[PDB]
mmCIF file of N, CA, C and O in Angstrom:
data_model
loop_
_atom_site.group_PDB
_atom_site.id
_atom_site.type_symbol
_atom_site.label_atom_id
_atom_site.label_comp_id
_atom_site.label_asym_id
_atom_site.label_seq_id
_atom_site.Cartn_x
_atom_site.Cartn_y
_atom_site.Cartn_z
ATOM 1 N N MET A 1 26.297 -25.047 7.583
ATOM 2 C CA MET A 1 26.945 -24.875 6.544
ATOM 3 C C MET A 1 26.889 -25.633 4.873
ATOM 4 O O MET A 1 26.566 -26.851 4.885
ATOM 5 N N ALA A 2 27.399 -24.806 4.057
ATOM 6 C CA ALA A 2 27.319 -25.407 2.832
ATOM 7 C C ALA A 2 28.054 -24.649 1.783
ATOM 8 O O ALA A 2 28.733 -23.758 2.027
ATOM 9 N N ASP A 3 27.678 -24.701 0.507
ATOM 10 C CA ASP A 3 28.428 -24.063 -0.943
ATOM 11 C C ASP A 3 27.528 -23.607 -2.029
ATOM 12 O O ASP A 3 26.455 -24.237 -1.953
ATOM 13 N N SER A 4 27.813 -23.425 -2.803
ATOM 14 C CA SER A 4 27.235 -22.670 -4.163
ATOM 15 C C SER A 4 27.584 -23.821 -5.015
ATOM 16 O O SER A 4 27.406 -23.573 -6.647
ATOM 17 N N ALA A 5 27.685 -25.175 -4.736
ATOM 18 C CA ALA A 5 27.724 -26.146 -5.451
ATOM 19 C C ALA A 5 27.304 -27.458 -5.445
ATOM 20 O O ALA A 5 26.499 -28.088 -6.048
ATOM 21 N N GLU A 6 27.079 -27.765 -3.916
ATOM 22 C CA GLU A 6 26.458 -28.876 -3.130
ATOM 23 C C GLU A 6 24.658 -28.670 -3.566
ATOM 24 O O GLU A 6 24.230 -29.804 -4.130
ATOM 25 N N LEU A 7 24.270 -27.394 -3.277
ATOM 26 C CA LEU A 7 23.011 -27.003 -3.570
ATOM 27 C C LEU A 7 22.608 -27.031 -5.312
ATOM 28 O O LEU A 7 21.602 -27.844 -5.363
ATOM 29 N N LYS A 8 23.655 -27.266 -6.040
ATOM 30 C CA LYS A 8 23.117 -27.201 -7.495
ATOM 31 C C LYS A 8 23.247 -28.767 -7.824
ATOM 32 O O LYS A 8 22.259 -29.372 -8.213
ATOM 33 N N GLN A 9 24.350 -29.543 -7.161
ATOM 34 C CA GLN A 9 24.273 -31.054 -7.202
ATOM 35 C C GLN A 9 22.808 -31.586 -6.756
ATOM 36 O O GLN A 9 22.486 -32.547 -7.232
ATOM 37 N N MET A 10 22.442 -31.132 -5.541
ATOM 38 C CA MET A 10 21.312 -31.798 -5.001
ATOM 39 C C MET A 10 20.187 -31.555 -5.718
ATOM 40 O O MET A 10 19.313 -32.301 -5.912
ATOM 41 N N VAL A 11 20.206 -30.300 -6.340
ATOM 42 C CA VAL A 11 18.978 -29.528 -6.761
ATOM 43 C C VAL A 11 18.932 -30.493 -8.198
ATOM 44 O O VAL A 11 17.616 -30.951 -8.934
ATOM 45 N N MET A 12 19.833 -31.003 -8.873
ATOM 46 C CA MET A 12 19.929 -31.762 -10.165
ATOM 47 C C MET A 12 19.455 -33.264 -9.730
ATOM 48 O O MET A 12 19.381 -33.969 -10.761
ATOM 49 N N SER A 13 19.226 -33.382 -8.075
ATOM 50 C CA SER A 13 18.647 -34.810 -8.373
ATOM 51 C C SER A 13 17.287 -34.589 -7.927
ATOM 52 O O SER A 13 16.857 -35.513 -7.506
ATOM 53 N N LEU A 14 16.642 -33.425 -8.121
ATOM 54 C CA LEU A 14 15.318 -33.042 -7.663
ATOM 55 C C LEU A 14 14.416 -33.404 -8.871
ATOM 56 O O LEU A 14 15.208 -33.411 -10.098
ATOM 57 N N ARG A 15 13.161 -33.720 -8.636
ATOM 58 C CA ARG A 15 12.444 -34.522 -9.807
ATOM 59 C C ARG A 15 11.306 -33.194 -10.478
ATOM 60 O O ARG A 15 11.728 -32.179 -9.668
ATOM 61 N N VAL A 16 10.774 -33.394 -11.534
ATOM 62 C CA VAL A 16 10.305 -32.271 -11.920
ATOM 63 C C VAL A 16 8.776 -31.482 -10.936
ATOM 64 O O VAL A 16 9.224 -30.727 -10.621
ATOM 65 N N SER A 17 8.697 -32.812 -10.471
ATOM 66 C CA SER A 17 7.864 -32.173 -8.897
ATOM 67 C C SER A 17 8.129 -31.297 -8.207
ATOM 68 O O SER A 17 7.846 -30.590 -7.655
ATOM 69 N N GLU A 18 9.294 -31.995 -7.839
ATOM 70 C CA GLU A 18 10.355 -31.273 -6.828
ATOM 71 C C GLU A 18 10.447 -29.766 -6.954
ATOM 72 O O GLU A 18 10.646 -28.995 -6.284
ATOM 73 N N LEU A 19 10.962 -29.805 -8.348
ATOM 74 C CA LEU A 19 11.326 -28.197 -9.113
ATOM 75 C C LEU A 19 10.108 -27.640 -9.348
ATOM 76 O O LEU A 19 10.559 -25.944 -8.792
ATOM 77 N N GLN A 20 8.918 -28.163 -9.214
ATOM 78 C CA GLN A 20 7.766 -27.580 -9.443
ATOM 79 C C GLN A 20 7.665 -26.409 -7.719
ATOM 80 O O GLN A 20 7.511 -25.487 -7.496
ATOM 81 N N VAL A 21 7.979 -27.236 -6.669
ATOM 82 C CA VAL A 21 7.983 -26.761 -5.273
ATOM 83 C C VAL A 21 8.754 -25.777 -5.066
ATOM 84 O O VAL A 21 8.834 -24.526 -5.030
ATOM 85 N N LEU A 22 10.369 -26.147 -6.049
ATOM 86 C CA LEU A 22 11.531 -25.018 -6.000
ATOM 87 C C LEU A 22 10.708 -23.714 -6.185
ATOM 88 O O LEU A 22 11.195 -22.627 -5.982
ATOM 89 N N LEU A 23 10.175 -24.023 -7.622
ATOM 90 C CA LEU A 23 9.799 -22.908 -8.232
ATOM 91 C C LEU A 23 8.646 -22.260 -7.892
ATOM 92 O O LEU A 23 8.552 -20.783 -7.674
ATOM 93 N N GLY A 24 7.922 -23.062 -7.482
ATOM 94 C CA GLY A 24 6.629 -22.978 -7.034
ATOM 95 C C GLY A 24 6.386 -21.965 -5.614
ATOM 96 O O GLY A 24 5.711 -21.045 -5.377
ATOM 97 N N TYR A 25 7.656 -22.542 -4.820
ATOM 98 C CA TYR A 25 7.767 -22.093 -3.704
ATOM 99 C C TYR A 25 8.747 -20.149 -3.453
ATOM 100 O O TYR A 25 8.917 -19.654 -2.888
ATOM 101 N N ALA A 26 9.316 -20.234 -4.841
ATOM 102 C CA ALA A 26 9.752 -19.028 -5.150
ATOM 103 C C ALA A 26 9.347 -17.940 -6.186
ATOM 104 O O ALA A 26 9.263 -17.425 -6.181
ATOM 105 N N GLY A 27 7.813 -18.797 -6.646
ATOM 106 C CA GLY A 27 6.972 -18.085 -7.251
ATOM 107 C C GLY A 27 7.129 -18.233 -8.601
ATOM 108 O O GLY A 27 6.385 -18.226 -9.407
ATOM 109 N N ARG A 28 8.477 -18.265 -9.223
ATOM 110 C CA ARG A 28 8.636 -18.626 -10.387
ATOM 111 C C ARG A 28 7.830 -19.492 -11.030
ATOM 112 O O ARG A 28 7.422 -20.450 -10.523
ATOM 113 N N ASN A 29 7.420 -19.438 -12.156
ATOM 114 C CA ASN A 29 7.040 -20.357 -13.001
ATOM 115 C C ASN A 29 7.432 -21.672 -13.282
ATOM 116 O O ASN A 29 8.558 -21.924 -13.344
ATOM 117 N N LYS A 30 6.627 -22.496 -13.287
ATOM 118 C CA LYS A 30 6.937 -24.063 -13.624
ATOM 119 C C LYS A 30 6.191 -24.694 -14.282
ATOM 120 O O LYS A 30 4.841 -24.804 -14.503
ATOM 121 N N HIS A 31 7.226 -25.155 -15.580
ATOM 122 C CA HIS A 31 6.293 -25.644 -16.964
ATOM 123 C C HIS A 31 7.243 -25.815 -17.790
ATOM 124 O O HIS A 31 7.721 -24.958 -18.664
ATOM 125 N N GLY A 32 7.575 -27.687 -18.121
ATOM 126 C CA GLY A 32 8.740 -27.875 -18.872
ATOM 127 C C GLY A 32 9.315 -28.748 -18.702
ATOM 128 O O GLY A 32 8.776 -29.721 -17.353
ATOM 129 N N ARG A 33 10.378 -29.338 -19.351
ATOM 130 C CA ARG A 33 11.068 -30.320 -18.669
ATOM 131 C C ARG A 33 11.805 -30.395 -17.606
ATOM 132 O O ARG A 33 12.218 -29.186 -17.157
ATOM 133 N N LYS A 34 12.447 -31.628 -17.248
ATOM 134 C CA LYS A 34 13.460 -31.802 -15.831
ATOM 135 C C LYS A 34 14.630 -30.464 -16.088
ATOM 136 O O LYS A 34 14.919 -29.516 -15.368
ATOM 137 N N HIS A 35 15.106 -30.492 -17.561
ATOM 138 C CA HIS A 35 16.424 -29.721 -17.980
ATOM 139 C C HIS A 35 16.030 -28.270 -17.877
ATOM 140 O O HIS A 35 16.718 -27.275 -17.265
ATOM 141 N N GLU A 36 14.635 -28.179 -18.253
ATOM 142 C CA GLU A 36 14.155 -26.820 -18.445
ATOM 143 C C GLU A 36 13.815 -26.118 -16.809
ATOM 144 O O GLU A 36 14.567 -25.114 -16.537
ATOM 145 N N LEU A 37 13.481 -27.236 -16.033
ATOM 146 C CA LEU A 37 12.932 -26.758 -14.920
ATOM 147 C C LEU A 37 14.100 -26.304 -14.176
ATOM 148 O O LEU A 37 14.485 -25.766 -13.126
ATOM 149 N N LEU A 38 15.265 -27.475 -14.089
ATOM 150 C CA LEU A 38 16.928 -27.595 -13.717
ATOM 151 C C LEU A 38 17.325 -26.503 -13.827
ATOM 152 O O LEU A 38 17.811 -25.676 -13.412
ATOM 153 N N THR A 39 17.393 -25.596 -15.379
ATOM 154 C CA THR A 39 17.823 -24.574 -15.834
ATOM 155 C C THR A 39 16.992 -23.330 -15.088
ATOM 156 O O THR A 39 17.974 -22.321 -14.691
ATOM 157 N N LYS A 40 16.103 -23.325 -14.894
ATOM 158 C CA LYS A 40 15.618 -22.364 -13.985
ATOM 159 C C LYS A 40 15.922 -22.060 -12.529
ATOM 160 O O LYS A 40 16.172 -21.293 -12.320
ATOM 161 N N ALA A 41 15.903 -23.616 -12.207
ATOM 162 C CA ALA A 41 16.456 -23.475 -10.712
ATOM 163 C C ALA A 41 17.722 -23.178 -10.590
ATOM 164 O O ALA A 41 18.031 -22.641 -9.615
ATOM 165 N N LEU A 42 18.230 -23.572 -11.466
ATOM 166 C CA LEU A 42 19.880 -23.403 -11.264
ATOM 167 C C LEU A 42 19.971 -21.774 -11.748
ATOM 168 O O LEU A 42 20.957 -21.133 -10.802
ATOM 169 N N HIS A 43 19.171 -21.254 -12.219
ATOM 170 C CA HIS A 43 19.420 -19.811 -13.018
ATOM 171 C C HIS A 43 19.085 -18.920 -11.477
ATOM 172 O O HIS A 43 19.796 -17.780 -11.316
ATOM 173 N N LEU A 44 18.004 -19.416 -10.684
ATOM 174 C CA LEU A 44 17.927 -19.175 -9.310
ATOM 175 C C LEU A 44 19.207 -18.722 -8.428
ATOM 176 O O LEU A 44 18.757 -18.058 -7.536
ATOM 177 N N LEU A 45 19.559 -19.788 -8.358
ATOM 178 C CA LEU A 45 20.982 -19.902 -7.695
ATOM 179 C C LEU A 45 21.828 -19.143 -7.774
ATOM 180 O O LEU A 45 22.401 -18.508 -7.440
ATOM 181 N N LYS A 46 21.995 -18.702 -9.370
ATOM 182 C CA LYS A 46 22.930 -17.876 -10.093
ATOM 183 C C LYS A 46 22.292 -16.519 -10.024
ATOM 184 O O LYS A 46 23.059 -15.334 -9.702
ATOM 185 N N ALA A 47 20.954 -16.341 -10.030
ATOM 186 C CA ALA A 47 20.454 -15.377 -9.820
ATOM 187 C C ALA A 47 20.104 -14.929 -8.097
ATOM 188 O O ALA A 47 19.622 -13.986 -8.300
ATOM 189 N N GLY A 48 20.321 -15.562 -7.342
ATOM 190 C CA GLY A 48 20.134 -15.404 -5.773
ATOM 191 C C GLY A 48 19.012 -15.811 -5.133
ATOM 192 O O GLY A 48 17.967 -15.165 -5.608
ATOM 193 N N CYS A 49 19.233 -16.875 -4.971
ATOM 194 C CA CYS A 49 17.812 -17.457 -4.093
ATOM 195 C C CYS A 49 17.833 -17.625 -2.788
ATOM 196 O O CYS A 49 18.792 -18.343 -2.304
ATOM 197 N N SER A 50 16.975 -16.994 -2.118
ATOM 198 C CA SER A 50 16.980 -16.944 -0.539
ATOM 199 C C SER A 50 17.628 -18.509 -0.310
ATOM 200 O O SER A 50 17.212 -19.556 -0.846
ATOM 201 N N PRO A 51 17.780 -18.507 1.458
ATOM 202 C CA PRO A 51 18.050 -19.884 1.595
ATOM 203 C C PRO A 51 17.137 -20.506 1.898
ATOM 204 O O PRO A 51 17.037 -22.057 2.587
ATOM 205 N N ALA A 52 15.868 -19.843 1.944
ATOM 206 C CA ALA A 52 14.644 -20.722 2.430
ATOM 207 C C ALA A 52 14.233 -21.973 0.973
ATOM 208 O O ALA A 52 13.831 -23.038 1.667
ATOM 209 N N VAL A 53 14.618 -21.550 -0.072
ATOM 210 C CA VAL A 53 14.700 -22.574 -1.211
ATOM 211 C C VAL A 53 15.771 -23.672 -0.963
ATOM 212 O O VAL A 53 15.425 -24.748 -1.271
ATOM 213 N N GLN A 54 16.986 -23.096 -0.375
ATOM 214 C CA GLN A 54 17.951 -24.216 -0.333
ATOM 215 C C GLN A 54 17.713 -25.057 0.725
ATOM 216 O O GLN A 54 18.434 -26.354 0.363
ATOM 217 N N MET A 55 16.716 -24.943 1.728
ATOM 218 C CA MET A 55 16.248 -25.806 2.657
ATOM 219 C C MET A 55 15.640 -26.805 1.853
ATOM 220 O O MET A 55 15.861 -27.712 2.492
ATOM 221 N N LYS A 56 14.571 -26.156 1.302
ATOM 222 C CA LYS A 56 13.930 -27.221 0.583
ATOM 223 C C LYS A 56 13.952 -28.388 0.014
ATOM 224 O O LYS A 56 13.894 -29.499 -0.329
ATOM 225 N N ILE A 57 15.554 -27.402 -0.961
ATOM 226 C CA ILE A 57 16.347 -28.385 -1.771
ATOM 227 C C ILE A 57 16.967 -29.777 -0.729
ATOM 228 O O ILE A 57 17.195 -30.870 -1.088
ATOM 229 N N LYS A 58 16.970 -29.365 0.697
ATOM 230 C CA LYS A 58 17.487 -30.330 1.338
ATOM 231 C C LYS A 58 16.686 -31.433 1.953
ATOM 232 O O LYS A 58 17.062 -32.459 2.031
ATOM 233 N N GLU A 59 15.623 -30.454 2.232
ATOM 234 C CA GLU A 59 14.452 -31.370 2.556
ATOM 235 C C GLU A 59 14.175 -32.777 1.169
ATOM 236 O O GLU A 59 13.944 -33.577 1.850
ATOM 237 N N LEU A 60 14.088 -31.942 0.307
ATOM 238 C CA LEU A 60 13.154 -32.700 -0.770
ATOM 239 C C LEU A 60 14.549 -33.686 -0.828
ATOM 240 O O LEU A 60 14.216 -34.634 -1.434
ATOM 241 N N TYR A 61 16.124 -33.430 -1.271
ATOM 242 C CA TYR A 61 16.848 -34.374 -1.423
ATOM 243 C C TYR A 61 17.024 -35.472 -0.301
ATOM 244 O O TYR A 61 17.189 -36.419 -0.349
ATOM 245 N N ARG A 62 16.761 -34.740 0.971
ATOM 246 C CA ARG A 62 16.737 -35.854 2.160
ATOM 247 C C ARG A 62 15.784 -36.934 2.319
ATOM 248 O O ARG A 62 16.167 -37.870 2.123
ATOM 249 N N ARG A 63 14.965 -36.922 1.990
ATOM 250 C CA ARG A 63 13.578 -37.398 2.012
ATOM 251 C C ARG A 63 13.942 -38.816 0.622
ATOM 252 O O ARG A 63 13.258 -39.594 0.821
ATOM 253 N N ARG A 64 14.605 -38.260 -0.294
ATOM 254 C CA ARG A 64 15.432 -38.760 -1.456
ATOM 255 C C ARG A 64 16.370 -39.651 -1.084
ATOM 256 O O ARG A 64 17.215 -39.970 -1.845
ATOM 257 N N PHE A 65 16.928 -39.164 0.220
ATOM 258 C CA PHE A 65 18.171 -39.877 0.394
ATOM 259 C C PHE A 65 18.642 -40.935 0.020
ATOM 260 O O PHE A 65 18.125 -42.243 0.137
#
């Protein structure tokens, strides 16, 4: 269980390297600052991104507990 808010907050806690995985694992292009990457990742959420990427966010954030 989750929502379309925690994912954002969680993703917002991801680093550039992490964002690269989110985009890389999503296919999307990854190249820019964190804000730029975050915006891309965020747009992915609003653009609708499978729960596959959502899981990586939990794992990425988890390891960064």
